[PDB]
């Protein structure tokens, strides 16, 4: 899209409730697969998302 | 086995819900019993698709 | 008809081409990627009609630019860890009890 | 008279032998059910059997090569490769019919990803 | 009445456009309920009739009509111990097991 | 026309285009106006952004775009538009 | 199931649900997920 | 809505409309076969249950001469049989 662009976008509604949030000390995500390359690519994806 | 260990163990059994009376092991089997718990039809589907003119 | 890869510019917005997880489309992927054990005095098979490239769980919908552009928009949904809890030493002090529970993600109807 | 006087093209999947399933060839169907600790492998296999029969019967002589039956969450992607012999209207009608039929068959969001090719992509000859 | 229902249905049409990309398709299926919710909750759509743990773990209140000190008390205490350790059954199934035992002993 | 299109682009207002016939009529008139009045580069940018992603053009729209190219004396683009129309 | 259990209390490739021949045919084609012959 | 395969990409508005109508007709035929033989599709395997993927029943179930049958048939929108029922 070089000219025709959306003028404004509906950001989703995220309301800040009053109930206190849960706290997680640790969160272990064990991913199982038949392929090591898929697991390596998914590791890269998940790690990049986590850093950001 | 000190009788103190005996009654402390049967108190633990009452708290955690195990059988307080040790009923040996042969009659302990029903505890295990109660602790646990169509290619036909798919073919007339294939026949029906044939009749409607949508198979083969 | 001609593939639409011919119309794609070299400075396009790739995330819009693959917004979500989609299979390998040789008419949509503008790469001359080849894959297949070559025959004697042969070359790896071309992408058009390659079932082996269609069998890969491609990460085309997840590129570094796409990942950044997604997780920048997803920041609005996050909360902040209490800064008082700097290490596990204070976690085991202010919140003694630890509750461990597991969720499982398989593939199927159930 | 007397007794003393008397006295094929192959595609990639077809060409490669089964012992290259993890060396050269791949897996057509991809699901977690068969993994260690995962359940319902036999259910997934039965679904695959029916799905392949129903695709090959709903697209007779059209599929150039075998399907690819992918599953993510409850999704069911049939990435099939067909020929350009049938008219596009028939392809669209069959896609809609099969998608709806399978979605009500398995109570899951099934989808099709037809890929038309001019002809069979022969790998070698046996 | 039918008038209001059809009126709302044909209001639904003015904003009835074809899906414009994959994300919109996923959103539409999620609203229809065809897609799973994320993050996955393995007990989604299941509440076990709003039962509480005390209704599953303490099932000895249903043994009041049985003999209170005989061998039948022993057998039924064991049976309720077995049922209370069953995570696959609802409270209703456990109580109907107890009721079947009650009836069978009553006949005998 | 630009004001109307901007109103269309606000939020989810695009859902108010209606059936395919109305969408085709709206976009065809919009592109005809663009060809008649915008500078040739902007018309080409709109042509690339709208066709075929937004609508399938009418032969009359191609005639208008050819006339706009003639007025701009940008005759070297004619092969590309011919290939697209084919 | 419940009724028969109550009285009792008082007292081939079936793994995949396939015919043994068919499992070979499927697994050779690579059809089964992760079943690589070694 | 359309497939990315060049042979299946519509080339004209008429062709696009024809493809869309063919897809819709296939969907309608699928719905018809679903509702004509619900028994082949009653088996639910998905947790949570998905009501949208279950066959729809259009036949009146209440047969006795009562107001309840006639209300059921109003809900099913069967005009001629509803006036017969009244």
From Swiss-Prot, chain B:
<keyword id="KW-0687">Ribonucleoprotein</keyword>
<keyword id="KW-0689">Ribosomal protein</keyword>
<dbReference type="GO" id="GO:0006412">
    <property type="term" value="P:translation"/>
</dbReference>
<comment type="subunit">
    <text>Component of the mitochondrial small ribosomal subunit (mt-SSU). Mature mammalian 55S mitochondrial ribosomes consist of a small (28S) and a large (39S) subunit. The 28S small subunit contains a 12S ribosomal RNA (12S mt-rRNA) and 30 different proteins. The 39S large subunit contains a 16S rRNA (16S mt-rRNA), a copy of mitochondrial valine transfer RNA (mt-tRNA(Val)), which plays an integral structural role, and 52 different proteins.</text>
</comment>
<dbReference type="GO" id="GO:0005739">
    <property type="term" value="C:mitochondrion"/>
</dbReference>
<keyword id="KW-0496">Mitochondrion</keyword>
<dbReference type="GO" id="GO:0032543">
    <property type="term" value="P:mitochondrial translation"/>
</dbReference>
<protein>
    <recommendedName>
        <fullName>Small ribosomal subunit protein mS33</fullName>
    </recommendedName>
</protein>
<dbReference type="GO" id="GO:0005743">
    <property type="term" value="C:mitochondrial inner membrane"/>
</dbReference>
<dbReference type="GO" id="GO:0005763">
    <property type="term" value="C:mitochondrial small ribosomal subunit"/>
</dbReference>
<keyword id="KW-0007">Acetylation</keyword>
<dbReference type="GO" id="GO:0003735">
    <property type="term" value="F:structural constituent of ribosome"/>
</dbReference>
Swiss-Prot record, chain C:
<comment type="subunit">
    <text>Component of the mitochondrial small ribosomal subunit (mt-SSU). Mature mammalian 55S mitochondrial ribosomes consist of a small (28S) and a large (39S) subunit. The 28S small subunit contains a 12S ribosomal RNA (12S mt-rRNA) and 30 different proteins. The 39S large subunit contains a 16S rRNA (16S mt-rRNA), a copy of mitochondrial valine transfer RNA (mt-tRNA(Val)), which plays an integral structural role, and 52 different proteins.</text>
</comment>
<comment type="similarity">
    <text>Belongs to the mitochondrion-specific ribosomal protein mS35 family.</text>
</comment>
<protein>
    <recommendedName>
        <fullName>Small ribosomal subunit protein mS35</fullName>
    </recommendedName>
</protein>
Swiss-Prot record, chain F:
<comment type="function">
    <text>Mitochondrial RNA-binding protein that has a role in mitochondrial translation.</text>
</comment>
<protein>
    <recommendedName>
        <fullName>Small ribosomal subunit protein mS39</fullName>
    </recommendedName>
</protein>
<feature type="repeat" description="PPR 9">
    <location>
        <begin position="58"/>
        <end position="86"/>
    </location>
</feature>
<comment type="subunit">
    <text>Component of the mitochondrial small ribosomal subunit (mt-SSU). Mature mammalian 55S mitochondrial ribosomes consist of a small (28S) and a large (39S) subunit. The 28S small subunit contains a 12S ribosomal RNA (12S mt-rRNA) and 30 different proteins. The 39S large subunit contains a 16S rRNA (16S mt-rRNA), a copy of mitochondrial valine transfer RNA (mt-tRNA(Val)), which plays an integral structural role, and 52 different proteins. Associated with the 12S mitochondrial rRNA (12S mt-rRNA).</text>
</comment>
<comment type="similarity">
    <text>Belongs to the mitochondrion-specific ribosomal protein mS39 family.</text>
</comment>
<feature type="repeat" description="PPR 8">
    <location>
        <begin position="23"/>
        <end position="57"/>
    </location>
</feature>
UniProtKB/Swiss-Prot annotation, chain H:
<comment type="function">
    <text>Mitochondrial RNA-binding protein that has a role in mitochondrial translation.</text>
</comment>
<feature type="modified residue" description="N6-acetyllysine">
    <location>
        <position position="39"/>
    </location>
</feature>
<comment type="subunit">
    <text>Component of the mitochondrial small ribosomal subunit (mt-SSU). Mature mammalian 55S mitochondrial ribosomes consist of a small (28S) and a large (39S) subunit. The 28S small subunit contains a 12S ribosomal RNA (12S mt-rRNA) and 30 different proteins. The 39S large subunit contains a 16S rRNA (16S mt-rRNA), a copy of mitochondrial valine transfer RNA (mt-tRNA(Val)), which plays an integral structural role, and 52 different proteins. Associated with the 12S mitochondrial rRNA (12S mt-rRNA).</text>
</comment>
<protein>
    <recommendedName>
        <fullName>Small ribosomal subunit protein mS39</fullName>
    </recommendedName>
</protein>
<feature type="repeat" description="PPR 1">
    <location>
        <begin position="62"/>
        <end position="86"/>
    </location>
</feature>
<comment type="similarity">
    <text>Belongs to the mitochondrion-specific ribosomal protein mS39 family.</text>
</comment>
């Amino acid at each position: 899209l070089h000219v025709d662009v959306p003028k404004d976008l509906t950001k989703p509604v995220v309301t800040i409730s009053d109930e206190p949030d849960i706290l997680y000390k640790r969160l272990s995500v064990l991913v199982k697969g038949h392929d090591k390359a898929v697991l390596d690519s998914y590791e890269y994806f998940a790690v990049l998302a986590a850093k950001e | 086995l000190s009788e103190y260990a005996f009654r402390m163990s049967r108190l633990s059994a009452r708290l955690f819900g195990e059988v307080t009376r040790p009923t040996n092991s042969k009659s302990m089997k029903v505890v295990k019993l109660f602790s646990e718990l169509n290619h036909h039809t798919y073919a007339e589907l294939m026949q029906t698709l044939r009749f409607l003119g949508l198979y083969r | 008809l001609p593939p639409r890869t011919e119309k794609m510019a070299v400075d396009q917005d790739w995330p819009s081409v693959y917004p979500v997880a989609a299979p390998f489309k040789p008419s949509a992927v503008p790469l001359p990627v080849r894959m297949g054990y070559p025959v004697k005095k042969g070359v790896p098979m071309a992408k058009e009609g390659n079932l082996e490239l269609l069998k890969i769980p491609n990460f085309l919908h997840l590129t570094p630019v796409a990942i950044k552009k997604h997780c920048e928009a997803l920041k609005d949904f996050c909360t902040e860890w209490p800064a008082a809890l700097d290490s596990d030493e204070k976690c085991e002090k202010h919140f003694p009890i630890e509750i461990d529970s597991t969720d499982y993600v398989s593939s199927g109807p159930s | 008279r007397e007794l003393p006087c008397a006295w094929k093209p192959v595609t990639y999947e077809e060409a490669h032998a089964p012992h290259y399933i993890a060396h050269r060839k791949g897996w057509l169907s991809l699901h977690t059910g068969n993994l260690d600790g995962e359940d319902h492998a036999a259910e997934r296999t039965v679904e695959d059997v029916f799905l392949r029969k129903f695709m090959w019967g709903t697209f007779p002589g059209c599929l150039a090569d075998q399907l690819v039956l992918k599953r993510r969450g409850n999704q069911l992607e049939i990435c099939a490769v067909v020929l350009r012999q049938l008219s596009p209207h028939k392809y669209y009608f069959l896609v809609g019919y099969s998608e709806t039929l399978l979605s009500y068959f398995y109570k899951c969001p099934v989808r099709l990803h037809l890929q038309t090719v001019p002809s069979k992509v022969v790998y070698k000859y046996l | 009445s039918l008038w209001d229902v059809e009126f709302a249905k044909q209001l639904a049409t003015v904003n009835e456009q074809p899906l414009q990309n994959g994300f919109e398709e996923l959103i539409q299926w999620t609203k229809e309920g065809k897609l799973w919710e994320f993050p996955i909750n393995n007990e989604a759509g299941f509440d076990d009739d709003g039962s509480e743990f005390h209704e599953h773990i303490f099932l000895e209140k249903h043994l009041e009509s049985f003999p209170k000190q005989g061998p039948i008390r022993h057998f039924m205490e064991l049976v309720t111990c077995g049922l209370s350790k069953n995570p696959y059954l609802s409270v209703k199934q456990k109580v109907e097991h107890i009721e079947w035992f009650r009836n069978y002993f009553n006949e005998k | 026309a630009y004001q109307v299109h901007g109103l269309l682009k606000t939020g989810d207002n695009w859902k108010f285009i209606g059936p395919d016939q109305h969408r085709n009529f709206y976009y065809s008139k919009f592109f005809d106006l663009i060809c008649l009045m915008e500078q040739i580069d902007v018309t080409l940018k709109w042509y690339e952004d709208l066709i075929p992603s937004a609508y399938f053009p009418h032969s009359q729209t191609m005639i208008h775009l050819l006339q706009a190219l003639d007025v701009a004396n940008r005759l070297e683009v004619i092969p590309k538009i011919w290939k697209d129309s084919k | 199931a419940d009724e028969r259990l109550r009285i009792n209390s008082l007292r081939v490739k079936r793994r995949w649900r396939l015919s043994r021949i068919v499992f070979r045919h499927l697994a050779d084609h690579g059809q089964l997920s992760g079943i690589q012959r070694a | 809505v359309f497939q990315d395969d060049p042979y299946l990409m519509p080339a004209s508005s008429l062709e696009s409309r024809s493809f869309l109508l063919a897809k819709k007709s296939g969907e309608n035929v699928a719905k018809f076969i679903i509702n004509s033989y619900p028994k082949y599709f009653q088996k639910d395997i998905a947790e949570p249950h998905i009501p949208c993927l279950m066959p729809e029943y259009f036949e009146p179930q209440i047969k006795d001469i009562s107001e309840a049958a006639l209300k059921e048939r109003i809900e099913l929108r069967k005009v001629k049989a509803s006036v017969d029922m009244f």
